[PDB]
């Protein structure tokens, strides 16, 4: 209940993600690794690419053994290829204790590592049905777990805001009680390869979207670290919008804006954070025909964008968008929460965290119980 060692372990940039500082081999060479449920792969930079502060230099570890094995795994945006083996593995802001770990040594990529960033890596925190190039390379989690008394789980604590520096923490084995306020209140892990949940209803402003909850999670909703926004399916997207939109009249903005093809810029301190709507997803609860709701905020959902040359002005760029993979909880959801990685009861608590941007009017919410029929029916076969 309180792992006061491993608060505030995370750094990052705006846009940028929550990385935790790691190493791995013997001696240990120390990277800073971007914290990510959205994937099943220890991934980390091991060749002098011109973007990266420093890299996993296999030569120089006395432990790394080699799987004599490759793996190439492209996205919708970009690719890395690595080559597979395995080295001790620990974590300085972490549970005193080092692991052997499947490592893929990145040795080709396009548009993975950003410019400009301080991360070399990727900690894929999801399952092993997920993993590259099949199920049969055990996560790092995983391998924490069966080789360690850490317990099944880890919770995380996104905290938001020159590009500004973001933090957190990242409580691995355990839950830090100061990290929220409030209840946590658990969604079921529907099934465990991505960390996919199921969203039963969504509100704007208290406004039910009225939509066959089934869109909320064609083809599937999952919690994900390594995703910015709140990515919604289309149709959803499209409803929330209009929505959104209506709840907002107050103030006119270009069609660009909602798609995320233009920023929006205001005078200096002067957001009308108080014209736009709050969004509530509830979630499956635990029993039966029981769900919550989690509740964010426009400082959530409308992130500044600070790197602006051609602007004197405070820009910020909406960041829900559209999906072809499902809904997305990216950091857009995340920052608003304490997020509970319950692995070992096969569930996902939220809670109001301690940490979350908020105004004197609104705060980030979690709240039930309620009454939802059909919640199964949400789920898409
Ligand atoms: C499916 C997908 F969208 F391509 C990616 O999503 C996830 N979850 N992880 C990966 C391995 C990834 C994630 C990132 N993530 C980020 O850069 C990032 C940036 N800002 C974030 O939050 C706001 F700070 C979170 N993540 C970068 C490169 C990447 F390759 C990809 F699989």
Redo the contacts with the bound molecule.
Sequence with gaps: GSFVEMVDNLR?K?????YVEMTVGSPPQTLNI?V?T??SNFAVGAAPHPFLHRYYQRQLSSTYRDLRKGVYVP????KWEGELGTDLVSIPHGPNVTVRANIAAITESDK?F?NGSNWEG?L?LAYAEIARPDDSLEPFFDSLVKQTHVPNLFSLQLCGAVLAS?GGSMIIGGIDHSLYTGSLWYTPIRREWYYEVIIVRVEINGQDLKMDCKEYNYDKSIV?????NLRLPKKVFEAAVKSIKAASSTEKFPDGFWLGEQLVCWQAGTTPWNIFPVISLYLMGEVTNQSFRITILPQQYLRPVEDVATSQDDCYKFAISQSSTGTVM??VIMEGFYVVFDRARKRIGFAVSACHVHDEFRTAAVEGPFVTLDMEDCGYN
């Design positions: 990052g705006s846009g940028q993600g929550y971007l990510d959205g994937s996205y919708t945006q970009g993975f950003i990727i894929g973001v994900d670290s390594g995703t910015t990216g950091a």
